[PDB]
Amino acid sequence: GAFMSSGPRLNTDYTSANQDSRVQFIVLHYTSTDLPHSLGILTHGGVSAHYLIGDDEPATVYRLVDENRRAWHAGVSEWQGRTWLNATSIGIEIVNQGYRDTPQGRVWYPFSEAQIQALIPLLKDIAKRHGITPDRIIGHSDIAPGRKVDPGPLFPWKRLADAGLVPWPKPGELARRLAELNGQLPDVRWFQQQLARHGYLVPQTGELEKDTRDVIGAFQMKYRPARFDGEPDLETAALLLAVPTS
Amino acid sequence: GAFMSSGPRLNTDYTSANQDSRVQFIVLHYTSTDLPHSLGILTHGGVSAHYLIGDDEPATVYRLVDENRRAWHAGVSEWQGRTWLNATSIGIEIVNQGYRDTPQGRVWYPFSEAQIQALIPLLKDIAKRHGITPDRIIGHSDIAPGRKVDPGPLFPWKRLADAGLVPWPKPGELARRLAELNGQLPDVRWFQQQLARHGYLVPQTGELEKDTRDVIGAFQMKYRPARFDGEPDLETAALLLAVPTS
Q1: Which CATH superfamily is domain A21-166 in?
Q2: How many angstroms separate the CA of residue B244 from the nearest CA in chain A?
Q3: Nearest to B65 by CA among A222, A14, A31
Q4: Do the domains A21-166 and A167-246 sit in the same CATH topology, yes or no?
Q5: CB–CB of A54/A35 below 8 Å?
Q6: What share of chain B is helix, strand, coil (3-state, %, to 5)?
Q7: Which residues form the N-acetylmuramoyl-L-alanine amidase domain (chains A, B) (predicted)?
Q8: Ramachandran bin of B98, using left for φ above 0, alpha for ψ from -120 to 50, beta for the remaining angles
Q9: Rounded to an integer, what distance in angstroms lies between the CA atom of residue B126 and that of residue B120?
Q10: How do B51-53 and B89-94 pair as beta strands?
């Protein structure tokens, strides 16, 4: 002094062997709108995501929020007992109109081949860098069943499974589990137990109220999109047995 | 520079304004062991933390895990409905023996002025960088009331409160709240409701069993350590009103 030394002085001589990434899940969404309105919604006004996949050919991947920052895409959410997933997730939005109501039922919009071709390498890149296992790459509908229905019944989950990115029944397993069930439908409590085992937030009351029906429906929309009304049936029970968790 | 990306090609022309930190909470711990052994455990064992505050004079602050990484300090935990807090918290360990059981009962170990003088500016620095509010700087006992007691009944929470770091009753407020109560002890249900509002995982049964007693006790250990037996009383009710939640 001159100027005398003062202030904080961290000792950084030691670094722990036991640490990993704060990012534990990747969550997939659709935007429900076109490219320019997607960019509008995802940059101001309170909703955001880390990546946006455009609807061009080839499909542009925009980075909107750095991976080491928290984007606001999950809201009220739960997967495998982990709640409020924003802080521990990476969110990927895909340009897609979602659905339209018609007097005959909802009609959804398809995802392009180019979009799937851009998404798969992106997911491999993120999963490898953060050590994210396939059971933790899920949709907004998985973590907020009933409240959210994206990426919807037209999303080609099996294409992701083929690339090793999400759990999927092995060949012949659906048929084996159907034979195991032997035509007898398990009760609602059994469906609730199975869904929770897969990671879903679901009541364990043994009674089929809207909150349980919404969870059954989310699972159906992902694995048996032909019918996702949330009604227990034999095929859904077989899929609850057939889809791996490991 | 000198390397291209290992990942897919990205468009970075757009950046979202709606983003913030992945770090939501700061959790305080004591080590229950001496300085050199604490450094050993936190560097080479199953437990880790971002910072360690020594029991030397002045108190050395070690950084053991980068803030952008997940350390393993919280275990099964919940605060304000957020579960599994490792991925979303910064963990700070303080060298202190914790407690010791004797025939005259349990005894506790004090924290030193040197430790407090190192902890306060550290907390200010972290809280400012990550935008962490006072209600989210908490102890292991707060997030795991059934399992953990640290930092215990001797931890100087009020010193942190004087520096604007944690919630604490304003002068005169406890007396005013005691007066609003007008001699009437609220029922157990009311106690459970206030504790959940403050952030605790607590049953909502209206019955006073062990889990509710553990939570009332954790709150008492922090705000009324003269008695933390988990029993509802007028003073604890008054504190549940006087300690602000916003």
Answers
A1: Peptidoglycan recognition protein-like (3.40.80.10)
A2: 23
A3: A14
A4: no
A5: yes
A6: 35, 15, 50
A7: 11-152
A8: left
A9: 10
A10: parallel
Q: How far apart are CA A220 and CA A110, in angstroms?
A: 18
The rounded distance, in Å, linking the Cα atoms of B107 and B115 is: 20
Contacts of A10 in chain B (CB under 8 A): 61-63
Interface touch A13/B62, C-beta < 8 Å: yes
From the number of C-beta atoms within 10 Å of its C-beta (0-12, 13-18, 19+), residue A223 rates as buried
* Contacts for B102 with CB less than 8 Å, ≥ 6 apart: none
| Residue ranges of the binding site of B for Zn(2+) | 29, 140, 150
Cis omega (within 30 of 0) on the bond before B171? no
Beta bridge partners of A96: A33
- B16 vs A20, A42, A118: nearest CB: A42
Determine the residue among A19, A122, A123 to mutate to test chain B binding: the one whose Cβ has the most chain B Cβ atoms within 10 Å.
Answer: A19
- β-pairing verdict for A25-30 and A137-139: parallel
Distance from CA of B64 to the nearest CA of A (A): 4
Q: Is A1 exposed, middle or buried (0-12, 13-18, 19+ CB in 10 A)?
A: exposed
Catalytically active residues of A are 93
- Homologous superfamily (CATH) of A167-246 is PGBD-like superfamily/PGBD (1.10.101.10)
- DSSP character at residue A190: H
Q: Is B209 a catalytic residue?
A: no
Choosing among A10, A13, A22, which should be mutated to test the B contact, i.e. which has the most B CBs within 10 A?
Answer: A22
N-terminal to C-terminal alpha carbon distance within chain B:
48
Nearest by CB to B19, from A14, A70, A84: name it: A70
CB neighbourhood size of B164 (10 A): 12
Q: How far apart are CA B3 and CA B178, in angstroms?
A: 65
CA closest to B18 among chain A residues:
A46
| Listed resolution, Å | 1.7
> Cα separation of B189 and B232, whole Å?
11
Interface test with B, best of A6, A11, A12, A18 (most B CBs within 10 A): A18
DSSP state of B206: S
Closest in B14, B44, B82 to A84, CB measured:
B82
Structure tokens at A55: 């609807």
The tokens for A109 are 């919009």
Q: Smallest Cα–Cα separation from B152: which of B100, B203, B210, B81? A: B100
- Strand order across the beta sheet in which B89-94 lies: B61-63, B51-53, B89-94, B25-30, B137-139
Q: Which of B57, B67, B93, B209 is catalytic?
A: B93
Per-domain residue ranges of chain A: 21-166, 167-246
Interface size, chain A vs chain B, as Cβ–Cβ contacts under 8 Å: 144
